[PDB]
Amino acid sequence: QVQLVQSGAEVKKPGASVKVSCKASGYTFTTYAMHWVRQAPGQRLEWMGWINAGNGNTKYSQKFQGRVTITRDTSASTAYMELSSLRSEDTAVYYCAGGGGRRLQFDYFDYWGQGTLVTVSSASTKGPSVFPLAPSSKSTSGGTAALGCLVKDYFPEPVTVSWNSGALTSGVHTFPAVLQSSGLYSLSSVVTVPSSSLGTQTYICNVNHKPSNTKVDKKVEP
Amino acid sequence: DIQMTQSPSTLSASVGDRVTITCRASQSISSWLAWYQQKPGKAPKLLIYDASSLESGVPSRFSGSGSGTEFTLTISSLQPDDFATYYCQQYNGYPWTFGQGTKVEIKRTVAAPSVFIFPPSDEQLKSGTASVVCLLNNFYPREAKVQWKVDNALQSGNSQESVTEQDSKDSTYSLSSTLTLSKADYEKHKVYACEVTHQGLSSPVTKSFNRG
Amino acid sequence: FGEVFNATRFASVYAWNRKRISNCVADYSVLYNSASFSTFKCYGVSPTKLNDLCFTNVYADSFVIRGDEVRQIAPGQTGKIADYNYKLPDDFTGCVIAWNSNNLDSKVGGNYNYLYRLFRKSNLKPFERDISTEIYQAGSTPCNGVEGFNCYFPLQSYGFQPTNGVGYQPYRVVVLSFEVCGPKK
């Protein structure tokens, strides 16, 4: 089966230039059909362009006229692209696709790369802010109460969060990150437990941030 | 450019059922379309191209139809394997756009949320900004209406809403509303509340507290 | 007929697919009365009485060309099609049916799914669909996969946009070389 693989996650800064790249796995090279597309986080897919993996043809999109370029390397048979004059709106996931294979060319996307993450930001790596989320006996609902571990003002994606290092698995809830006006990321993780063993047991969140190498644990005080 | 809108934006279903999808084009198309499936946290699947053809490697449920303008997607029975969005793509002409997005969920009873509130911790109070959490757990369907009432007054702009995405077996929804403010705000307002109206609830429900 | 005639799409003149449509009632009377095909060029046989005429096996070379390259294909007259893409031998005993198909073929900005040999390395042979787009080597500089001086990639984008004139538009052509009658009872 034809497969497409590419580079990893990748964090740039307004005004800079960026290069993503994917290697192909093709039974044939019959004017292969490298054809890039884009995906702004959870909104319309908007189309990138197509290079002619056959020889050299470089047809591009209108909205990205004049700032995006693509080529390919033959004996590596990979395809590369620039992407220039980056801006904040530019943050997205980036897809290789194509691979018509049987016929010479198409205009549909039948062999996708499983995705590249590009984040255009102006801030820098920063450790995660962490606070507990202590419930109250006022809201004892069926003998069960919620409890959490807030992370604020962190960069960049993401922050793996567990509870007591995998000791708890029931009712686990980890909400997705959200932008703030400051350009910073924030997450709220919560879980509910029977209130019967509230003041008799121990629950600690375990937050993990590799880009800053920080590992933070905080006991919650009800 | 080629215009593309798709109806409805969201739909409902249950396992072992048929779900219709309609892709609407403003302007004439000659069977120039593909249907894609999109799982969360994923790279897309194609399963219809050309508005009719069924590409290999797929379950036989899938079937496109339509030509001209109205385009339709069909599946006979509903596997769990069908729970994702679905996109339509034109390729009649230049720059090729996509649709809006059409997801199915999992239907059941109109479960009701559990409401909770978390006041700011101290350490947040000597950070310099204040955060207040209102939580809704296990409500159905996602659709919900949350408000803030501070000192018996509505608040706007300063609140953010973050919704989890439906559970695989819990098959429900959870939501967090965060109210953020500056310390000058915190002590000159003295009582706080979050209110939620939901379809499952008999009445709109308010929850609240004061300074400690 | 309609299946191998006006379909959803067709092929290019470098990879024309000859479909053996035989052992059935060959109703060419309905094709003649429909007259939805600009050209009928029945060379070798009569196209009006082709329905009753009983052959043993019929073909259907399916490909698209330009309105200027629809004349190129001819039993005898050679050119970019009848000497490099689709060669029509002088023993042609069938019917070349041609009609414009911009609606279900021409994509705006030029058809990229259709590519035709502008410079085939060697001369094409009678009734041959050369699929190898080897870079033409012009005397010196052997272009065995190499590009640049004296190197000309044969397969060239078939410019087919609906904005293009009839002379540069996809002419769906299914030629039925005869080597399958009407009622016969």
Residue numbers in the entry:
A (entry chain H): 20 to 241
B (entry chain L): 20 to 231
C (entry chain C): 338 to 516, 524 to 529
Please share excerpts from the published article on this structure.
Through crystal and electron cryo-microscopy (cryo-EM) structure analyses, P36-5D2 was found to target a conserved epitope on the RBD of the spike protein, bypassing the three key mutations (K417N, E484K, and N501Y) responsible for immune escape from many potent neutralizing mAbs. Based on the binding specificity, P36-5D2 was closest to the class III RBD-targeting mAbs, including REGN10987, S309, C110, and C135 (8, 27, 30, 41). Similar to REGN10987 and S309, P36-5D2 barely competed with ACE2 for binding to RBD, suggesting that their mechanism of neutralization may involve immunoglobulin G (IgG)-mediated spike crosslinking on virions, steric hindrance, or aggregation of virions.
We went further to determine the cryo-EM structures of the P36-5D2 Fab bound to the SARS-CoV-2 spike trimer at 3.7-Å resolution. In one model, P36-5D2 Fabs bound two “up” RBDs and one “down” RBD. In the other model, P36-5D2 Fabs bound two “down” RBDs and one “up” RBD of the spike trimer. Consistent with the crystal structure analysis, the cryo-EM structure clearly demonstrated that the mutant residues K417N, E484K, and N501Y were not involved in the P36-5D2 epitope. Furthermore, P36-5D2 and ACE2 only had two overlapping residues at G446 and Y447, which was sufficient to exert spatial hindrance in disrupting the interaction between ACE2 and RBD. These results collectively revealed the highly conserved nature of the P36-5D2 epitope and provided a molecular basis for its broad and potent neutralizing activity against all the SARS-CoV-2 VOCs and mutant strains tested here. Crystal and cryo-EM structural analyses showed that P36-5D2 recognized a highly conserved epitope on RBD, which is accessible in both “up” and “down” conformations and able to withstand the mutated residues K417N, E484K, and N501Y that compromised many neutralizing mAbs, including some approved for EUA.
